[PDB]
Amino acid sequence: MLIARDITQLVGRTPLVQLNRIPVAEGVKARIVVKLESMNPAASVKDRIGVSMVEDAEAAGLIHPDKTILVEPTSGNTGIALAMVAAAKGYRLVLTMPETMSLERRAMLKAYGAQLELTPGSQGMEGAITRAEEIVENTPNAYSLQQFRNPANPKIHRETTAEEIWADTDGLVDIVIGGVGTGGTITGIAETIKPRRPQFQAIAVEPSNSPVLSGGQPGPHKIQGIGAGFIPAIFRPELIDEVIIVDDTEAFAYARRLARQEGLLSGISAGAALWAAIQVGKRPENEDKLIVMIQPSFGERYLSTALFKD
Amino acid sequence: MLIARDITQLVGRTPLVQLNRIPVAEGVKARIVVKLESMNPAASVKDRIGVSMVEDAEAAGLIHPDKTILVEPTSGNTGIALAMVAAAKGYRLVLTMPETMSLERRAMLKAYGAQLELTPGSQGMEGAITRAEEIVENTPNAYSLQQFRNPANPKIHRETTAEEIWADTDGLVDIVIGGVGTGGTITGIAETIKPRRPQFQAIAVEPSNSPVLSGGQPGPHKIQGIGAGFIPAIFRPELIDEVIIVDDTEAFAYARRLARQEGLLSGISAGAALWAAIQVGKRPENEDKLIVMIQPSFGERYLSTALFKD
Numbered sequence: 001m002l003i004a005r006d007i008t009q010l011v012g013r014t015p016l017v018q019l020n021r022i023p024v025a026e027g028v029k030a031r032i033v034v035k036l037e038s039m040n041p042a043a044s045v046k047d048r049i050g051v052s053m054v055e056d057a058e059a060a061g062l063i064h065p066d067k068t069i070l071v072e073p074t075s076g077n078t079g080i081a082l083a084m085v086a087a088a089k090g091y092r093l094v095l096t097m098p099e100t101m102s103l104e105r106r107a108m109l110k111a112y113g114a115q116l117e118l119t120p121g122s123q124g125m126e127g128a129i130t131r132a133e134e135i136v137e138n139t140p141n142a143y144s145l146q147q148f149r150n151p152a153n154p155k156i157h158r159e160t161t162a163e164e165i166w167a168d169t170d171g172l173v174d175i176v177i178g179g180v181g182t183g184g185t186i187t188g189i190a191e192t193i194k195p196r197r198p199q200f201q202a203i204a205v206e207p208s209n210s211p212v213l214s215g216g217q218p219g220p221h222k223i224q225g226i227g228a229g230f231i232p233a234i235f236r237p238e239l240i241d242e243v244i245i246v247d248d249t250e251a252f253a254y255a256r257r258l259a260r261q262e263g264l265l266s267g268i269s270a271g272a273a274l275w276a277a278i279q280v281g282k283r284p285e286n287e288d289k290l291i292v293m294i295q296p297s298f299g300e301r302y303l304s305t306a307l308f309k310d
Numbered sequence: 311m312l313i314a315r316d317i318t319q320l321v322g323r324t325p326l327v328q329l330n331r332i333p334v335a336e337g338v339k340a341r342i343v344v345k346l347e348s349m350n351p352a353a354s355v356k357d358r359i360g361v362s363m364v365e366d367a368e369a370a371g372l373i374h375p376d377k378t379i380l381v382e383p384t385s386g387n388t389g390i391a392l393a394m395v396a397a398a399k400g401y402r403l404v405l406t407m408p409e410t411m412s413l414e415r416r417a418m419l420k421a422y423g424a425q426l427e428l429t430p431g432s433q434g435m436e437g438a439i440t441r442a443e444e445i446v447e448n449t450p451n452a453y454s455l456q457q458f459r460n461p462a463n464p465k466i467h468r469e470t471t472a473e474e475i476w477a478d479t480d481g482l483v484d485i486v487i488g489g490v491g492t493g494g495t496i497t498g499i500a501e502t503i504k505p506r507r508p509q510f511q512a513i514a515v516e517p518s519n520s521p522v523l524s525g526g527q528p529g530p531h532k533i534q535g536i537g538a539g540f541i542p543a544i545f546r547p548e549l550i551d552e553v554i555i556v557d558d559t560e561a562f563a564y565a566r567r568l569a570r571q572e573g574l575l576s577g578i579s580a581g582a583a584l585w586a587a588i589q590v591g592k593r594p595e596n597e598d599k600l601i602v603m604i605q606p607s608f609g610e611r612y613l614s615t616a617l618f619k620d
């Protein structure tokens with residue numbers, strides 16, 4: 001019998017899909033395919049790390065459902081992944097999240113029974129992180145899995161996300177394109193694949209308004225889920241070939257086209273990754289290369305935002 | 311390479327998950343497991359029929375993307391499934407839907423680029439169907455796949471949904487419980503499995519406020535996706551062992567517990583199916599029987615409703 005013990009054993013193992021309209025429309029000479037992290041149980045890539053971080057801490061005896069209050073600052077998806085895990089396992093969970101993130105994210109957290117404290121929009125992720133740190137320092141048995149630092153984040157991507165790409169492309173993937181939030185996705189992919197394919201390229205995507213991976217200064221932007229405003233500790237710049245900066249307008253435009261022209265309803269950051277993959281795929285040296293882009297989230301979580309509202 | 315041609319080749323093949331808290335809390339003597347139709351690409355069971363109905367009509371030369379205007383009355387999910395398919399394949403699509411269905415459903419349809427005409431809430435599905443029929447009768451090249459009559463609906467459930475249950479339970483499933491909207495799910499399951507397992511039970515679920523399968527009169531109710539207010543042509547009462555009626559309050563209560571106590575964020579109708587499965591699973595004759603319930607939809611589509619709002 002193939003019956004999962006619980007929802008945490010059903011995360012990852014997401015499929016690849018080719019694009020059929022957008023690349024030809026933009027004159028792309030490479031082959032662009034999409035890894036659909038929208039098909040995780042709670043509809044984002046973060047399900048993978050919600051599970052891995054919690055399992056890692058439990059195994060080391062660092063947390064226990066009967067006493068630990070999990071606390072995590074989030075732009076939404078990590079909070080939702082942990083909220084699902086917490087609901088399955090019986091953990092109390094408190095999220096801090098900036099008020100600028102989509103209304104759907106707030107409602108998702110509450111639906112799973114987690115506690116949410118919103119932090120001021122002007123303070124961005126820094127405000128969320130500071131508040132979470134204050135809660136953890138002060139509260140007995142509070143514990144932060146710390147998604148920007150936790151080795152279980154890049155590890156699960158090395159062991160699952162990257163292996164899936166490797167298998168599903170029969171070892172022929174040439175380039176992976178991924179927006180950076182925590183950096184775990186693109187880092188874990190590069191770590192696993194580069195040893196097997198020396199010419200493989202790992203390309204990071206960030207908002208042009210907050211180009212910190214590129215050496216620039218942090219700023220406000222609308223690409224929810226990427227552009228934390230600092231370089232995460234887990235991110236390994238030495239493994240990444242290049243950083244592509246993306247305007248908010250292009251992220252929104254390409255995410256809309258994903259839904260309407262490909263039937264791939266997608267978050268804003270998937271739009272940013274596609275715009276980037278288009279630019280890379282048009283380079284003459286990349287003709288007939290196989291480019292996999294990561295689609296981090298499903299677009300239903302974004303209907304209230306400027307992506308689709310009106 | 312395992313790369314899907316497009317999103318329509320990634321529907322179905324959904325997993326089973328055991329329940330870990332709710333059955334013991336209710337003194338259930340059977341084993342209740344859930345088939346997660348929330349994990350289809352657009353997060354409901356309807357993805358399966360959106361694909362099968364369109365492929366069937368295309369193969370027979372009855373529709374073509376360059377000319378057909380698809381038109382379908384819906385409570386939401388069939389419209390969304392067809393909207394995804396339409397976006398991938400380049401069909402124009404018009405949905406009629408009662409204003410009583412969740413706001414998320416409206417926004418989902420528009421996000422995929424479909425056209426929506428809302429019909430009066432007081433008229434329910436009958437109003438939606440009448441308007442769709444008026445559009446089709448009157449409009450050149452308009453075409454309704456007709457989800458309540460289309461043989462491709464129960465067929466795809468016979469060939470995919472039912473085979474998945476058969477395989478995943480190693481042929482040991484004793485009972486399937488499913489709410490009835492079109493009736494295709496529970497009918498196709500019963501058709502495939504009963505010949506292989508004479509003692510197998512197929513049990514239909516309907517709202518107590520609109521118990522038409524039970525021989526009663528139609529009425530208004532809040533279990534979105536089930537209780538059409540008539541017996542669908544595809545539904546085969548001779549294959550169904552029994553109909554269980556469910557109150558709106560119990561559907562809401564059990565859907566909330568699915569999210570918060572199992573980490574299975576679910577639509578309202580999944581709550582109705584669980585309440586039913588609990589009742590069946592408590593019967594002394596069903597001790598140690600394996601009961602699979604269908605979870606028709608993911609709960610993100612329902613955050614604006616009374617299920618979670620406030």
Ligand SMILES: *Cc1c(COP(=O)(O)O)cnc(C)c1O
Pocket residue numbers: 044045046076077078179180181182183184185186224225226267269270296297
């Ligand atoms: C997490 C996330 C990303 C980036 O993934 P990382 O592995 O954290 O870099 C992109 N988009 C969205 C919507 C996310 O939630």
Ligand SMILES: *Cc1c(COP(=O)(O)O)cnc(C)c1O
Pocket residue numbers: 354355356386387388489490491492493494495496534535536577579580606607
């Ligand atoms: C379609 C649907 C059902 C019932 O499935 P059928 O195969 O149409 O009987 C139940 N719940 C929801 C939310 C649906 O969209």
